[PDB]
Each structure stands twice: as C-alpha cells, then as structure tokens.
C-alpha cells in the first residue's frame, strides 16, 4: 500500500523527466489514448503515400480489451513523416493477439479468450461494426481446449498457422482446408511436448518445416513437421529459470533466435548447438512478455513486458568495453530504454517500412508510435 504508492510516484516522476528529454532521444513520438486497451499490435506491410503530401499512411492491426462491452478487431491508419480507426470488426471477447498472413495481408488470425482461434479477411467485412454485435469470423479454427496468446503464420507455406494455448498444446492448421459447418477447420496436427501453458510459437523464417515453442515449463522446443511423432520435439532446451513467454527468429541470421522470460532476461540461441545459451541480455526489472527482431538490422532486437519500459539491444556490442559507470546502467549491448509508457506493455511492432519506428501498446490504453534518434544508434 505505502510501497505501492512509492512505486507509483517513482514511475510518474520518471515519466515527467522522460517527457522533457524526448527531443534528445527521439525523432518522433506520437501518443494516443485508445478507447479500450489493446493487447496486440502489428504493422501491416503496405504504405500509402499521398500525391504532394509530406506524410505517408501506414496501418496497424490492433484489438480491444473491454470489461463488459463489445470487443472489436481494429485496423488503424497512422500518418508518418494523426491516428484514425479505419476498420472495426466484431470480435468475440478481447483480441489476445492478431497477426496477418504474409502471403495475403488481408487475412488476419486472432486469439480469443476461448478455445477458438479465428480468421478474418478484413476486406470482406464492412468497415463499420455490425450493429447486432455478433462475431462472424471467416474461419473458426478448432483443436484447443483453452485460450492462449501465441500465433504464427508460415511465411513459406501459404495458410499454415500455428497457435499456442494454456491447454499445454500447439495447434497447426492449413486454413486452405475445406471447412465443415460453422466454417470450422479442425487442427491438422497437435503438438503435445510441453507440460505446461504454451506461451508462444514461431515458424523459422527460411526452413518451412521448422518451428519453435516456449512454455511455462521453462523450455524452448524446436519442432520439425516432417517428423511423425508430435509428442516429442527435435530439441528440448532448458532455456530459463522461469516461464518462457516469447520467442523470435532472426530474419537475417538463420541459426539465431531469442526467447524472453519471467526471469527478466532475453536469451540468445544458436540452433547448431542448443546445449548452451549463446548470450543472456540482462537489464529488465520484471517479466518479459514480447521479443521481436528488427526488420532492418540483423543485430537489433527489442523486448517488453511488465516493467513498462521497452528495451532495445544491439548484439554487435556484446563484450565491448565500457566504463564501470556505464556498466551500472547495463551491459554494453543495451542500446535504448523506452520510457514512454507508465503501464505494462502488452505488445509492440517494428515498422517494416521505416527503420527504427516502433508502435507499442500498454494496459492503460496508451498506444505510442516512436522513433529513436540517429544519435543513439549511429557510431
């Protein structure tokens, strides 16, 4: 109580200082309070530049999280050198996560607070929500017994979707399969290696048969779909000293991936030798829930979670010399701490078209689109 009050004051005072220092650290900071908090954020891949205008239009997939109100899947537009909701689609319960299919960015899968995983083609619904408040997904993907968060599309196999669930399983669907009644597709495969809540799943970005999963059992598992046994992964890695909440494959380094954990660390892994962690990124003060590699720079990654402050890392600086005073602030590979949020970060996304732009969303309804200044990452 007293202790809670002190933390709240520290957070607020730090935010006031952060605010006054933004010109030194950013080239852009746009803050926007959403009607409802979003648990999810992902930039869509396409940008629209208007004739004779000094800005381009980028788009984001967002969701709502309501108390006792109708939820929606949202497409928002963002003008980059205003934020508007363009498309609003009825969704059953909060949108735990929403991700577009690489081969057709009109297609979006969502995780719900139920066992169903949903698919929408957003161009095949009205831009304004149906007044009935009824959710009408284009597909219902069944196979789980519980809700979950992890979701991953195979960028080399059209329509191959993986999903992680609190039921301890991973479901795979090919959404091109012929649906039965109620537009249902049953899981093509179910992977049962984990012994606890599965938090995240991710396809390898080059090898179409490989994927990884992470769970509350503290394991990272590497799976190969060419194997007949779905109860035993190709590799089981003792990854962390607490729950593993996220993983991300490096788009430019085919052997490298990262995992983020309740143990406050991001671990770096080399698929050629998973017996030994390659590196441990330390600095976060609380549980990490999301980790994403930069779409533009192979050494750059970011992580976020309960400590409210997204960290950006540059693994090119691992082992570099720094003053002992600098060491007090963190390891050499810590590049940036984003101080813009005062609540837990629920998700974030790197802009795929404008380097160094990130959108992050937090539990207090805030969405921020921001770009660190060149003086941070250059030299």
């Amino acid at each position: 109580s007293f202790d809670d009050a002190v933390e709240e004051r520290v957070i607020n005072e730090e935010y006031k200082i952060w605010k006054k220092n933004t010109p030194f650290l950013y080239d852009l900071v746009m803050t926007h309070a959403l009607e409802w908090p979003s648990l999810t954020a992902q930039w869509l891949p396409d940008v629209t530049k208007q004739d004779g205008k000094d800005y381009s239009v980028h788009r984001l997939i967002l969701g709502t999280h309501t108390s006792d109100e109708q939820n929606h899947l949202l497409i928002a537009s963002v003008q980059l050198p205003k934020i508007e909701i363009e498309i609003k689609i009825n969704h059953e319960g909060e949108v735990n996560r929403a991700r577009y299919m690489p081969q057709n960015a009109c297609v979006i899968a969502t995780k719900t607070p139920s066992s169903d995983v949903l698919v929408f083609d957003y161009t095949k619904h009205p831009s304004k929500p149906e007044p009935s408040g009824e959710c009408q997904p284009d597909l219902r993907l069944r196979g789980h017994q519980k809700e979950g968060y992890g979701l991953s599309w195979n960028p080399n196999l059209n329509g191959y979707l993986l999903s992680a669930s609190d039921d301890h399983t991973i479901c795979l669907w090919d959404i091109n399969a012929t649906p039965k009644e109620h537009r249902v597709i049953d899981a093509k495969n179910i992977f049962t290696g984990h012994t606890a809540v599965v938090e995240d799943v991710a396809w390898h970005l080059l090898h179409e048969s490989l994927f990884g999963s992470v769970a509350d059992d503290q394991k990272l598992m590497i799976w190969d779909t060419r194997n007949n046994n779905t109860s035993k992964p190709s590799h089981t890695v003792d990854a962390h000293t607490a729950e593993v909440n996220c993983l991300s494959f490096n788009p430019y380094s085919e052997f490298i991936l990262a995992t983020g954990s309740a143990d406050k660390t991001v671990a770096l892994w080399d698929l050629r030798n998973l017996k030994l962690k390659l590196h441990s990124f330390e600095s976060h003060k609380d549980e990490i829930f999301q980790v994403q590699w930069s779409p533009h720079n192979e050494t750059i990654l970011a992580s976020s979670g309960t400590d409210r402050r997204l960290h950006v890392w540059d693994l090119s600086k691992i082992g570099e010399e720094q003053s002992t005073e600098d060491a007090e602030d963190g390891p050499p590979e810590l590049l940036f701490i984003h101080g813009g949020h005062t609540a837990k970060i629920s998700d974030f996304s790197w802009n795929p078209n404008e380097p160094w732009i990130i959108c992050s969303v937090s539990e207090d309804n805030i969405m921020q689109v921001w770009q660190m200044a060149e003086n941070v990452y250059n030299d």
Binding site: N21, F24, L25, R309, D326, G339, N375, V376
Partner: peptide, 14 residues
C-alpha cells in the same frame, strides 16, 4: 555529446 546521448538513452531518458 554522442556519449551523453547514449547514456541518457540507456537510462531511459532520466
């Protein structure tokens, strides 16, 4: 200075 900025960056703007 570039170093001052990187320090401020690593300290989260505080």
């Amino acid at each position: 200075t570039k170093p001052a900025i990187r320090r401020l960056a690593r300290r989260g703007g505080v």
